Write a protein that binds this ligand. Structure first.
Ligand SMILES: [Cl-]
Ligand SMILES: [Cl-]
Ligand SMILES: [Zn+2]
Length: 316
């Protein structure tokens, strides 16, 4: 029997290429293990003539690829590249319209949480650490967001179509961002126990769960003390370029000029839809490809983002 071969390249990062000679009588899987062509699983396919010179993603299956994959993605999760490829096979088919000057996502595959996450990132100062996210985010800002959205799904361990939470999604992305300079000082005052200051750094310095209002967080929020009293927690010092205030969805009034952007969630714990609100010359509501405007906004808000640089309390 006549042996036929083609040259292809394998990769884990789509930058560093590895020359391979493949036998056209054997599947990609038999030669490389799980193999993907621009997100499509070709593990059970035999090489085509049209494949010559093309790049295939493989799993990090030797030491060189293990190092290349960690350096690019900053993960050693064995299932990561397969999850990234499985997502990309869908996100490459999504549309990414420019809405009010931002890259959004046309609704598909239950992706509203990703649209509001993507819109938010374009309005806050954030630098990613993994080259994969740096490279994909640059492309997303330019309007080609398929790789970025597939990476969000992979980093968050979410599949296409799965219910997502914006706060959790932002937590994962912030873990892979340089927030090392961010600092928060809180004071908690109990009329029985006295006062306790806490310092938070990095992601914990920019995220708070319990109120949407940055102003209320400065004045004080009531929380339980271990003694059984209500204590007051308030912000003493903030050093960060933004803050994110989150809460269970509740009817909330957004006032033009008092916040950067916000997420709205309509539905229940099992099922629902996110929209994005941005405060510009007026209030714009971006719902995937859809855009409306209003002077006032009230709805079931879950996350609000605010601009910051340096804040020090006047509370003694
Ligand atoms: Cl590679
Ligand atoms: Cl970046
Ligand atoms: Zn107490």
């Amino acid at each position: 029997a006549e042996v036929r071969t083609i040259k292809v390249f394998t990769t884990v990062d789509n930058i560093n290429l590895h020359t391979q000679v493949v036998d056209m009588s054997m599947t990609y899987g038999q030669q490389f293990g799980p193999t993907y062509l621009d997100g499509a699983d070709v593990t059970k396919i035999k090489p085509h003539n049209s494949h010559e010179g093309k790049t295939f993603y493989v799993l990090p299956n030797d030491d060189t690829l293990r190092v290349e994959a960690f350096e690019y993605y900053h993960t050693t999760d064995p299932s990561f590249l397969g999850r990234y490829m499985s997502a990309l096979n869908h996100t490459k088919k999504w549309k990414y319209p420019q809405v009010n000057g931002l890259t959004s996502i046309k609704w598909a595959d239950n992706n509203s949480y990703l649209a509001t996450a993507l819109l938010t990132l374009q309005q806050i100062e954030l630098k990613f650490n993994p080259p994969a996210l740096q490279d994909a985010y640059y492309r997303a800002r330019a309007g080609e967001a398929a790789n970025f959205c597939a990476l969000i799904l992979a980093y968050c361990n979410k599949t296409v179509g799965e219910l997502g939470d914006v706060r959790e999604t932002m937590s994962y992305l912030f873990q892979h961002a340089n927030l090392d300079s961010c600092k928060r000082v809180l004071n908690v005052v109990c009329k029985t126990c006295g006062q306790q200051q806490t310092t938070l750094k990095g992601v914990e310095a920019v995220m708070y769960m319990g109120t949407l209002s940055y102003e209320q967080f400065k004045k004080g929020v009531q929380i339980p003390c271990t003694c059984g009293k209500q204590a007051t927690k308030y912000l003493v010092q903030q050093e960060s370029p933004f803050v994110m205030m989150s809460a269970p969805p509740a009817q909330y009034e957004l006032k033009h000029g008092t916040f950067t952007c916000a997420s709205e969630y309509t539905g229940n714990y099992q099922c629902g839809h996110y929209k994005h609100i941005t405060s510009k010359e007026t209030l714009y509501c971006i719902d995937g490809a859809l855009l409306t405007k209003s002077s006032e906004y009230k709805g079931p808000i879950t996350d609000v983002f605010y601009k910051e640089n340096s804040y020090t309390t006047t509370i003694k």
